[PDB]
Write a protein that binds this ligand. Structure first.
Ligand SMILES: [Ca+2]
Ligand SMILES: [Ca+2]
Ligand SMILES: [Ca+2]
Length: 223
DNA sequence: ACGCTAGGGATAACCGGGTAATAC
DNA sequence: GTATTACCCGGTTATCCCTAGCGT
């Protein structure tokens, strides 16, 4: 075999790199299930060879969450998280962490569920067939948040920020969330765009499913 | 009198493209 | 000189959080 450490400094077209990539066949169960939530959430899955191979790009503010995701698909990620620091139009410095997998056919397994002809879509019964408690956990760590950010609140309502998807796509996601996980949720409007509102009634049932995957530095997102 | 929204803001993400390092 | 491609860019804004002030 070939160790990861031997190709953590070699160039992109390295012979030893390609032989290491041939040793890896598919994503493991944890990498696929989490991938679902990540692609629904904050991750970006892309092909440059028109569908032959795919890779995932990551960018987050939270260094620790970036570290956790990098460790997940450890064998798919060559480098440690890289730091950016950019100046925006106001003239403010913005600190963010970035990382990416190498391209590999194993990622086609994930991308074939979302990317159809360049543009990302959501299949009719995605949640019912593919979304697991682990998928919901990473999706929450990406898009999750509170409904009530007022200090001192009895409202334990969860929100999933899905402003990028169409109202139809989100409506279908709500159908899955209600049926598979018995969640009292529905679509709400924010900036003329859809979000998933989870009622405080289903908070216990939602928390129990995502407990065995949550990281401490992401516990602030919970009410 | 104050809980709870809808409205809003400066990000914290998401998109592709460019490049610099190997193979032949 | 052309193919390959992980790492690194810049464009750009929908995000997650914050809160005015509405509604009872
Ligand atoms: Ca997201
Ligand atoms: Ca996020
Ligand atoms: Ca976005």
């Amino acid at each position: 075999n070939i160790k990861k450490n031997q190709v953590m400094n070699l160039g992109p077209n390295s012979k030893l790199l390609k032989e290491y990539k041939s040793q890896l066949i598919e994503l493991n169960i944890e990498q696929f299930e989490a991938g679902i939530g990540l692609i629904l959430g904050d991750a970006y899955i892309r092909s440059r060879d028109e569908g032959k191979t795919y890779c995932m790009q990551f960018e987050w503010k939270n260094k620790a969450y970036m570290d956790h995701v990098c460790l997940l698909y450890d064998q798919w990620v060559l480098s440690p998280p890289h730091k950016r620091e950019r100046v925006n139009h106001l003239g403010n410095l913005v600190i963010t962490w970035t990382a990416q997998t190498f391209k590999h056919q194993a990622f086609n397994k994930l991308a074939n569920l979302f990317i159809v002809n360049n543009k990302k879509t959501i299949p009719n019964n995605l949640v019912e067939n593919y979304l697991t408690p682990m998928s919901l956990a990473y999706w929450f760590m990406d898009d999750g948040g509170k409904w009530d950010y007022n200090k001192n609140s009895t409202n334990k309502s969860i929100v999933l920020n899905t402003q990028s998807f169409t109202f139809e796509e989100v409506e279908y996601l709500v159908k899955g969330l209600r049926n598979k996980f018995q969640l009292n949720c529905y679509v709400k409007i924010n900036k003329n765009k859809p979000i998933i509102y989870i009622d405080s009634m289903s908070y216990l049932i939602f928390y129990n499913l995502i407990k065995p995957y949550l990281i401490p530095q992401m516990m602030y997102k919970l009410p």
